[PDB]
Design a protein around this ligand. Sequence first.
Ligand code: ACO
Ligand code: ACO
Ligand code: ACO
Ligand code: ACO
Ligand code: ACO
Lengths: 152, 346, 346
Amino acid sequence: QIALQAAKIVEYFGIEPRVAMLSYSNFSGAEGTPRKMKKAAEIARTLRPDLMIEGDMQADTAVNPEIMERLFPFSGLKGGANVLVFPNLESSNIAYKLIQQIGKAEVIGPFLTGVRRSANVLQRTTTVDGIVNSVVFTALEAQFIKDALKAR
Amino acid sequence: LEAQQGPSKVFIRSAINRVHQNSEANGGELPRIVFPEGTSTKVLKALATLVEERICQPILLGYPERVKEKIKALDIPLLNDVQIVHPSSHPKYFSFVEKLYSLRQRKGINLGEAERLMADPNYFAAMMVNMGEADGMVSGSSINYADAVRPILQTIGTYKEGIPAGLNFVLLEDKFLVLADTTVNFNPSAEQCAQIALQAAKIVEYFGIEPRVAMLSYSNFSGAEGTPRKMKKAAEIARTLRPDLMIEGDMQADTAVNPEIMERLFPFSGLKGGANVLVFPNLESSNIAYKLIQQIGKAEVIGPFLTGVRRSANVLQRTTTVDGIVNSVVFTALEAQFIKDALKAR
Amino acid sequence: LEAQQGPSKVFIRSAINRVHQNSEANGGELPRIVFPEGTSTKVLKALATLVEERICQPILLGYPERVKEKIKALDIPLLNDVQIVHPSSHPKYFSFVEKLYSLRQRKGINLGEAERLMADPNYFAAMMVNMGEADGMVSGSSINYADAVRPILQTIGTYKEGIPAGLNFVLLEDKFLVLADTTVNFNPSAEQCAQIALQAAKIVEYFGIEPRVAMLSYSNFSGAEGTPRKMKKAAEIARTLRPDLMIEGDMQADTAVNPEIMERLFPFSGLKGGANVLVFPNLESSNIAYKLIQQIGKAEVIGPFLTGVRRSANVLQRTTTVDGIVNSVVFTALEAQFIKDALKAR
Ligand SMILES: CC(=O)SCCNC(=O)CCNC(=O)[C@H](O)C(C)(C)COP(=O)(O)OP(=O)(O)OC[C@H]1O[C@@H](n2cnc3c(N)ncnc32)[C@H](O)[C@@H]1OP(=O)(O)O
Ligand SMILES: CC(=O)SCCNC(=O)CCNC(=O)[C@H](O)C(C)(C)COP(=O)(O)OP(=O)(O)OC[C@H]1O[C@@H](n2cnc3c(N)ncnc32)[C@H](O)[C@@H]1OP(=O)(O)O
Ligand SMILES: CC(=O)SCCNC(=O)CCNC(=O)[C@H](O)C(C)(C)COP(=O)(O)OP(=O)(O)OC[C@H]1O[C@@H](n2cnc3c(N)ncnc32)[C@H](O)[C@@H]1OP(=O)(O)O
Ligand SMILES: CC(=O)SCCNC(=O)CCNC(=O)[C@H](O)C(C)(C)COP(=O)(O)OP(=O)(O)OC[C@H]1O[C@@H](n2cnc3c(N)ncnc32)[C@H](O)[C@@H]1OP(=O)(O)O
Ligand SMILES: CC(=O)SCCNC(=O)CCNC(=O)[C@H](O)C(C)(C)COP(=O)(O)OP(=O)(O)OC[C@H]1O[C@@H](n2cnc3c(N)ncnc32)[C@H](O)[C@@H]1OP(=O)(O)O
């Protein structure tokens, strides 16, 4: 369900979503997180048959098309994933915070999805520019939701 | 002046220089590094660079004819004189079989099973490293981490009060971070996390940098049930085991690695100046974080390095490249030189 | 008249004669049995007798040289025209590697690991049996059961609504009991126990004997929580699956195999005349019981036989003798001929 919500959000920006269920194993399907991610990928593929959903895999395999093509050509995900789904809260939280801090790539969020109305919570360690970006995207989501409500 | 020479590429160059210095000190002796993936293409392509750079002395493993054919087909002339060893044809193969049978006789390995296992290049490389025939081994370039590191832990083992862990170096523009166990333990306990932090602190101190451990979590000093409680307890245990260090937890990644956020939000914490050792609550977080930082972040990460084992023994991720293999072999040669020097001091 | 001709003196001879009749009716073509342990003393010693009795056609696995040297040392003149093949040098080695990579790509095996796995004699033999190049395989005489049977289940697998399960024949003077299962399942549930009972009943009925199943336990129709409840439920499930059968449970071992005790104490039970197939609660009970009956009992047991697999594939116990090997290979030949006939008829 999280992958489907993220796919809808990505499709809102005119980008074809490619979903990867991250793990610490590469298509191993072993006990624990790998089996859960494999089942999640299967369920997501069943729910939205037209999507490019694959799992389980690791982050480098997911976000590098060359690695996936060279090592795992059997997988149905090609071109590199743009949606990443994490097995638990610690992994996603730590990964996104570390990418925000030590990486040179901008990170905007977190945005609360799955709620009826537009309502966002900023991280307590945010900056002024982070608040500006979050408010911009909250305004975007609020306008979208208001238009959808008015249409009905 | 000195702040403009951060370890972006100076770290690997300094490691190579230290390897050369240690080799020169010990009578110009290059550590013998065993590569059980003799027929791997990336292994040989990195070995060409390594032997050109005068870092280690490779000892390939497998059938000599097939290894020579692969070298000839891959067009590497520098690897024409390498001690290719067939595990079954070695003179000390039977001694290795007997030693492995003696080690794990009461763990499901008798003489027949030990003889069958020692034909596996991973097990023979582990025996070579353990029995002093070599200084270190590099494996895992073509197999998953579990089945490439199981021979090392079963044969070489871990020293007393030591837990195996996968340690990564994220070399930023000014300071290098150390990511704690990224490869071995699924859900380490508080004591295991404290031991991993101590091992990472020792490795950092080997490089002349004061270690400042931080137990990562999703909560900022919350102490709530689950991961935050485990990380807070692990920080307390690590502080007990080493009261002269800057260990603090639990916290989030931004709070740990940013001095300004920690100073503004949580001035009570004993971690000042930012953290350079980050310990992760479980395997998924550490693994995904390190791989994502490697790929989408311009910072260069090197590893994972197996820590806690008695002798030098490393496992490359199957996802690696030639440069990654070169860096990992350089650092495993450095570690093998250190271990050999320490063993020759008793 | 029929009393003086009992299983303990006629069963193996009848099995051999049935092998001979099935071979004669198919044009005198012996079943091709692949032996992964080509350099095993017991395997070759039993292969001498098997070739003398023309039960099967052996295909030893390993490098042709060490196997030939072992044959020369052990002085078996018959094992000189036998087929010795090397897994890596076979003309169909890469097809087998591709097949394993295709059917196990999402279970942790890719080409780099499939090529390594097919080098192992056990995996190569399992793939040969799966692809039809050999009728059956007989392994496990040099390694433990778990690592010998893992490639069989990974490659050959199980058929529809089938569960892997051991099966041993205890040949008494008057009748023969069938213990199942003794090798695979650690602690089967009620449904798994019912399926094992159905498989054992089918195998018993193949030998022209009406099967009577008993779900063994430590209690006599107590229905208490734990194992007795599991066996009561398993007996009910098996009765629902095969109404025409005579299945009873739960009961103790002595009540099942003694008609007098059952008719005196529990006349209400639907098992009349004594059980000839016995299903055990867990692995410890069945393994210990069958091994103790084999050793300290005067009744000869043969097995264990791996049931529930699509193709013919048996794993010997590592503590077996030459006679055990020849009996197991005879019954493997019977099963392989049955499987081949069923596949051809389809
Ligand atoms: C990046 C961007 O710009 S975002 C791009 C993608 N965005 C999205 O997909 C937005 C997704 N969300 C939405 O579209 C909106 O939430 C909508 C239009 C679906 C509204 O959700 P709805 O539930 O239909 O809202 P609505 O106000 O019509 O309420 C109807 C339902 O809400 C329930 N409801 C109303 N008030 C409440 C309440 N306080 N608590 C709980 N349920 C409530 C009603 O019971 C009713 O349920 P029912 O039909 O089963 O009886
Ligand atoms: C860069 C990357 O790609 S990271 C990939 C993600 N990581 C992985 O997939 C691997 C995850 N880790 C694992 O699976 C396990 O840690 C493995 C590799 C040890 C699996 O081996 P296991 O099935 O757990 O153990 P096994 O029974 O084979 O025994 C291995 C040995 O390791 C030892 N060992 C394993 N973990 C520990 C530990 N935390 N502390 C001490 N010893 C340990 C055991 O004691 C055992 O030694 P022994 O037989 O002498 O007692
Ligand atoms: C540099 C980096 O980047 S990482 C820096 C930190 N890394 C580290 O590994 C930290 C340093 N730690 C170590 O090197 C390890 O603790 C080791 C290798 C010293 C421990 O190895 P151990 O075998 O556990 O050492 P231990 O203290 O038990 O000594 C082994 C003893 O066995 C004896 N011994 C006798 N026969 C043998 C044998 N066949 N094999 C091994 N030891 C033997 C040795 O003589 C020695 O006794 P001694 O001290 O009287 O000479
Ligand atoms: C005479 C003697 O020597 S008896 C000695 C005592 N017996 C033993 O020690 C063996 C007992 N059994 C075991 O130890 C194990 O359960 C084994 C060896 C059967 C395999 O278990 P594992 O090693 O965990 O299996 P693994 O994860 O490798 O999977 C192997 C395959 O077997 C299959 N399998 C295993 N048990 C069953 C079962 N009861 N029903 C159906 N399939 C099964 C799995 O589905 C798997 O197939 P897959 O790859 O398509 O998913
Ligand atoms: C004698 C004694 O003491 S034991 C007596 C008791 N024994 C038994 O009851 C054993 C029962 N088992 C059997 O008869 C067999 O193992 C079977 C029939 C269950 C297995 O046969 P299968 O391998 O499943 O298939 P079979 O070859 O018969 O049928 C062909 C089908 O197999 C399918 N198939 C799938 N994978 C394969 C493969 N690797 N090889 C061949 N066929 C395959 C084909 O697609 C084909 O389907 P299709 O004809 O609809 O297109």
